[PDB]
């Protein structure tokens, strides 16, 4: 059915993420658990596949890797670590023993807020960002050793001037595009910046998405299937959804739309699988779906509520 269900978490849930096929969901909360749900074919219901304690502190971010590398999930916690897990199909579901830790990344010296796998066409790669204000890219150089996680790069996004106490939000989102040079977006407080791989194999800042007058709660790069330009949306605390058109002729930055329809902070901003629909959710307790006009402006095609 399509009625709600309990996650099984005691403390607040931070992130919910879909697998590649849209038939699985991974959940992480403050109770330091990662739950994975399965969408039973027969009874169209979501049912817990496995739950397990994974971190010593609150788990904030999560993400699945491309199916062409196996069943892999990654998690980021306030315990300054990022853990990788691989499903072992030879275990009963709900056993708490269905996902084996493949590794741990302790390089971060501050809590972590986000972790995102990179587009498959770049190998098992991933990024994370935390209080230390340092984005880090990791690579599973040898796709056979899903433990062989080397550190590919480190970039100082911010000056780290706020004690973890002073409001500090961070978000990541890679450019999904398969036929576009490697690059990813990063939000750190009021700022939002884009990184691009150089000829020297190092990340350089190629642009910034100006206009944010508060904390950026969320950002996501949209799948640019068909288009030549790129689009990344951001949900700010100042109560505005922003959609930036980024063209590389080297990167140009246009602001396409701004929307305050939410009157309050926009917490979640998400995209379609085709980058055809954009979603936003916020304080007003409403979810809005946006489509692009023929003129490339964005229009609210519907409002889901609470």
């Amino acid at each position: 059915h399509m009625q709600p269900f309990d996650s099984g978490h005691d403390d607040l849930v931070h992130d919910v993420v879909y697998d590649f096929y849209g038939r699985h969901v991974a959940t992480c909360s403050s109770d330091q658990h990662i739950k994975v749900f399965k969408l039973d074919k027969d009874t169209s219901n979501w049912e817990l596949s496995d739950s397990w304690r994974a971190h010593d502190s609150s788990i904030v971010a999560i993400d699945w890797a491309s199916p062409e590398y196996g069943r892999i999930i990654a998690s980021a916690s306030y315990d300054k670590t990022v853990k990788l897990w691989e499903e072992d199909p030879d275990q009963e579901e709900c056993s708490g023993r269905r996902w084996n830790k493949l590794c741990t990344l302790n390089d971060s010296k501050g809590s972590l807020y986000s972790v995102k796998f990179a587009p498959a066409h770049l190998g098992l790669k991933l990024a994370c960002l935390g209080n230390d204000g340092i984005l880090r890219l990791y690579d599973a150089l040898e796709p056979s050793d899903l433990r062989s996680w080397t550190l590919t790069s480190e970039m100082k996004v911010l000056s780290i001037p706020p004690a973890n106490h002073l409001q500090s939000d961070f978000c990541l989102s890679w450019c999904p595009s398969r036929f576009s040079p490697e690059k990813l977006a990063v939000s750190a407080l009021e700022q939002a910046i884009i990184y691009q791989r150089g000829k020297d194999g190092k990340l350089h800042v190629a642009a910034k998405l100006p206009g944010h007058k508060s904390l950026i709660r969320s950002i996501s790069w949209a799948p640019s299937i068909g288009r030549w330009y790129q689009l990344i949306a951001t949900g700010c605390k100042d109560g505005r959804i922003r959609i930036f058109k980024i063209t590389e002729k080297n990167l140009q930055v246009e602001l396409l739309s701004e929307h305050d329809d939410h009157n309050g902070e926009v917490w979640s901003v998400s995209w379609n699988l085709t980058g055809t629909i954009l979603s936003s959710a916020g304080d007003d307790g409403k979810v809005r779906l946006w489509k692009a006009t023929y003129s490339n402006e964005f229009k609210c095609m519907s409002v889901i509520t609470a």
Binding site: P4, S7, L12, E68, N272, L273, A281, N296, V303
Partner: protein
């Protein structure tokens, strides 16, 4: 202007103006399976949400397949070249047929929808979509730019059909409404009520002559008349005779028909008044309307489309006057904003076709897509856009190409998240046949979509591969494979 859907009506999470809670939402790889949740204390439920007004039905995919067949079958004819003499005539021949095919597929669909659920919000929208389409065919897919004389039969048939499928009135629930036989006024005869006549003219204005005759043989044909005034009995009778033979095939027979009618209205016009002061006029008006008096056709019209229709049926059957007919009609009765089809029809009739697409896209993305497509085939809308100093900018999915190309391609992309493997061929075919866009631009788009094909069978896999072959994406085949082993 947007749809304010009820996520999970039975149990909603946000209620208090209190702590504006952090709601988060993530769009899933499947249109019908998204998710909402909240980062707050004692809010640990997950809410699976499906995209507002999404069609998962089997009836719908059948419709989509049906339409894709017509599109594919149109061959080179789905394009319009701005065999020599006939290519023009033969082109319309096939396009006009395809239009009929589209209309058919949609009627069937609407049919299977009424049986399934009955009269759901979806049924209403699909009919509206059909009404706008009937109107569109009646005006551009029959006469091919010519006038009603070119083919009086087909035209009037489509017109009369369009009109009597747009709205329900006069609904038989209203026929009996006035035939209540309520005599709450000293001798309220069976017709002496303007109510009776308005509903008689209405029937005539809509070509509903059969019914029109019946409502007469209902009360005072022979009664009050064959007795009271023998003179007016003859008018009201052989008038009913003319109605019985309103020409629908020869624009000649009509020329002569309007003759006898005008003769009749003149004879009666100045003759033996052996009836009530009111019944006197109520019969002239009935005869004026049938003769085409413009003043009158507007008077007994409840909606602009009744006027418009009447004008063509009884005044002058020429589309060269539609511009004027429409104007007079709308001065009499404004466009009713209750329903979404009226305005689009007004636009069609008045030449600006392009502006029906946005509205139809709201009723149903699919219909709108193919509608735009066939309008391009007819050559009713074209890509006005242009390039540069002969010099990348390969963004298929844009305003660069047509408005039709745009709508078709969007529909393709929308199909990909539907997860119905039956339609994936439609999606890819739609993209592949897109009359605009580089073979390489398309290659890339398919290169990114294909990996999401919901294959299960062997035949499914062979299909994916055959497409990798056909487009030369071998590296991508070697990739879906890498998922097989590690699946």
């Amino acid at each position: 202007g947007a749809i304010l859907v009820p996520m999970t009506v039975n149990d909603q999470p946000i209620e208090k103006n209190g702590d504006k809670m952090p709601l988060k939402f993530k769009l899933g790889p499947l249109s019908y399976q998204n998710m909402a949740f909240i980062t707050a204390k004692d809010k640990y439920k997950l809410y699976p949400v499906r995209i507002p007004r999404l069609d998962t039905s089997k009836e719908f995919s059948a419709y989509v397949s049906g339409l894709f067949e017509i599109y594919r079958d149109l061959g080179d004819d789905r394009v319009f070249n701005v065999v020599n003499s006939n290519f023009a005539k033969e082109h319309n021949a096939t396009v006009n047929l395809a239009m009929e095919a589209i209309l058919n597929e949609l009627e069937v669909f609407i049919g299977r929808v009424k049986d399934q659920d009955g009269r759901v919000n979806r049924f209403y929208e699909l009919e509206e979509s059909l009404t706008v389409l009937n109107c569109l065919r009646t005006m551009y897919f029959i006469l091919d730019g010519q006038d009603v004389e070119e083919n009086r039969s087909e035209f009037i048939e489509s017109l009369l059909n369009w009109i009597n499928r747009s709205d329900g009135e006069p609904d038989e629930e209203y026929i009996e409404q006035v035939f209540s036989v309520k005599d709450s006024t000293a001798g309220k005869k069976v017709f002496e009520t303007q109510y009776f006549w308005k509903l008689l003219n209405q029937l005539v204005l809509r070509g509903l002559l059969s019914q029109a005759i019946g409502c007469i043989e209902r009360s005072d044909l022979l009664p009050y008349l064959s007795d009271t005034c023998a003179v007016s009995f003859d008018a009201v009778s052989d008038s009913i005779e003319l109605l019985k033979q309103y020409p629908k095939d020869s624009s000649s027979t009509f020329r002569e028909w309007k003759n006898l009618v005008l003769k009749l209205s003149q004879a009666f016009g100045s003759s033996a008044t052996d009836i009530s002061g009111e019944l006197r006029d109520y019969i002239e008006d009935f005869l004026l309307v049938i003769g085409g008096n413009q003043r009158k056709i507007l008077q007994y019209s409840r909606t602009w489309y009744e006027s418009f229709c009447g004008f063509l049926l009884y005044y002058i059957p020429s589309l060269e006057l539609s511009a004027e007919y429409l104007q007079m009609s709308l001065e009499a009765n404004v466009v009713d904003i209750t329903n979404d089809w009226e305005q689009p029809c007004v636009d069609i009739i008045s030449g600006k076709i392009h502006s029906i697409l946005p509205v139809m896209e709201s009723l149903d993305s699919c219909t709108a897509a193919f509608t735009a497509m066939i309008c391009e085939a007819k050559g009713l809308i074209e890509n006005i856009f242009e390039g540069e100093k002969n010099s990348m900018l390969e963004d298929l999915f844009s305003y660069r190409n047509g408005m039709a190309s745009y709508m078709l391609n969007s529909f393709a992309f929308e199909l990909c998240s539907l997860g119905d493997k039956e339609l994936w061929p439609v999606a890819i075919g739609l993209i592949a046949l897109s009359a605009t866009g580089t073979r390489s631009a398309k290659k890339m788009v398919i290169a990114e979509l294909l990996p999401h094909y919901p294959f299960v069978t062997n035949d499914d896999i062979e299909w994916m591969l055959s497409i990798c072959v056909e487009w030369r994406l071998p590296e991508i085949a070697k990739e879906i494979y890498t998922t097989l082993g590690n699946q």
